[PDB]
């Protein structure tokens with residue numbers, strides 16, 4: 001992810017087949033002649049898409065030009081959470097499935113995985129970061145406190161940001177309960193709140209290299225969103 005001063009990001013296509021699939025997902029959803037109500041509503045929850053981009057002298061080098069969802073914030077606190085029971089897609093080989101499950105074997109049980117976080121601390125005027133090994137260390141016993149850490153700043157637990165995140169996730173959950181045409185594997189939610197209010201909170205769906213046509217409810221995604229909502233709700237009682 002390359003942050004651009006004009007409030008966009010450039011996301012380089014992943015190697016094939018993943019990058020090409022993500023490009024086609026954004027192209028399908030943001031097609032100018034699309035009047036599918038399901039896809040028009042989905043646009044609200046994604047970063048705005050500005051099309052494929054490549055450097056003027058390098059047509060080989062492929063990026064997606066996307067809205068930087070952190071751009072309106074002064075000291076953005078950012079958390080990325082992978083959603084679902086399965087990180088592997090319906091056409092994964094046995095080895096691929098094993099690779100994905102071994103990255104975090106609690107995915108089926110918990111339904112989400114914290115990929116990372118960046119939290120502004122007011123007392124020190126500094127950021128605390130967690131990498132992928134943080135989230136992969138969390139279990140049923142530690143997931144509540146693991147998620148809570150994201151909302152520790154301003155000398156307090158930011159229950160305003162927690163409640164706002166629940167309210168934003170609930171709209172995404174409602175979209176998922178009103179569509180049976182896409183299933184999403186290894187996709188994420190990006191959470192942003194203001195570290196420097198309820199509060200400017202942003203919750204956006206990202207990472208679409210494993211989105212497939214479906215005939216059913218995305219049950220794993222729904223389970224993960226619900227569990228994540230339940231965890232967030234329990235943090236409101238702290």
Ligand SMILES: O=c1cc(-c2ccc(O)c(O)c2)oc2cc(O)cc(O)c12
Pocket residue numbers: 001009011047066067068069070078118190206207
């Ligand atoms: O707007 C986006 C903003 C970010 C982002 C910005 C700053 C960070 O410190 C970070 O960890 C992620 O990451 C994205 C990643 C995406 O795949 C799509 C996006 O629109 C964004």
